[PDB]
Write an enzyme that holds these catalytic residues in place. Sequence first.
Site, short mmCIF file in Angstrom:
data_model
loop_
_atom_site.label_atom_id
_atom_site.label_comp_id
_atom_site.label_asym_id
_atom_site.label_seq_id
_atom_site.Cartn_x
_atom_site.Cartn_y
_atom_site.Cartn_z
CB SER A 43 -0.98 0.03 1.17
OG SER A 43 -2.00 -0.93 0.91
CE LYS A 46 -3.98 0.99 -1.13
NZ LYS A 46 -4.53 0.23 0.00
CB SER A 103 -4.64 1.32 3.70
OG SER A 103 -3.52 1.01 2.91
CD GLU A 139 -4.17 -2.40 -3.53
OE1 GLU A 139 -4.12 -3.61 -3.19
OE2 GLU A 139 -3.38 -1.52 -3.08
#
Length: 261
Positions: A43, A46, A103, A139
Amino acid sequence: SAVQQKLAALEKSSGGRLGVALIDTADNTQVLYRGDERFPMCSTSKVMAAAAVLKQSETQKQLLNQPVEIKPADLVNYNPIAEKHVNGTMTLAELSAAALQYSDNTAMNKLIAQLGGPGGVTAFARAIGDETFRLDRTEPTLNTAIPGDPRDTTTPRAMAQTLRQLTLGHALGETQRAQLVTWLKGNTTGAASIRAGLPTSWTVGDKTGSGDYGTTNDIAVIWPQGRAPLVLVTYFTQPQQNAESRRDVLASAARIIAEGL
């Protein structure tokens, strides 16, 4: 250095592979441990997706207010915020905030789609001088963290430099940089990671990441009171596919770095 001996001892005690990069903006000095090895970003990627959308908003001034539909089919494995808005909309600002501060994986996929796919996120990294970052998947599959797989990896050195440019440098416009910093400072997932190894009085903005192989990551900008800010990237991964997360290792790495200043 003493810090590198302590980081190597920490790694040895942990059973995994630790990567650290510190940039001290006071003198632009750097501390690196496995700084040029690839680690799965999970993550932490991101941040790059959000920053790429922020970059688009420098020209498309209203972009962040653009509503984006959240459909049931959009939901993936971890969607704490997007689930609250299924069959409704969220703006690109709200999706960026959700991706960064909670997240949210659905939010990340919407950011990726807005950029035209993973290649659009990677392109932004290249445009700001990061030749190392690569985002290959969406994802949740970008978190497989398979040993040796170069997909969805970066190095500590590259991510530290990139995070510095995005938050303390001028890779983004002034409004956009401030928004990113505000989002990072408001992260909710980081209490047990870098933050836990630092003086409680320091201000931290960070993005965690976790994945398979016990991959446990955190990237942070740190504002000590009365001192130039620091950028700290801590990546950790383990040899067993089903290993448990080890946020304590990141806290301990942060503590060792902080002791050395």
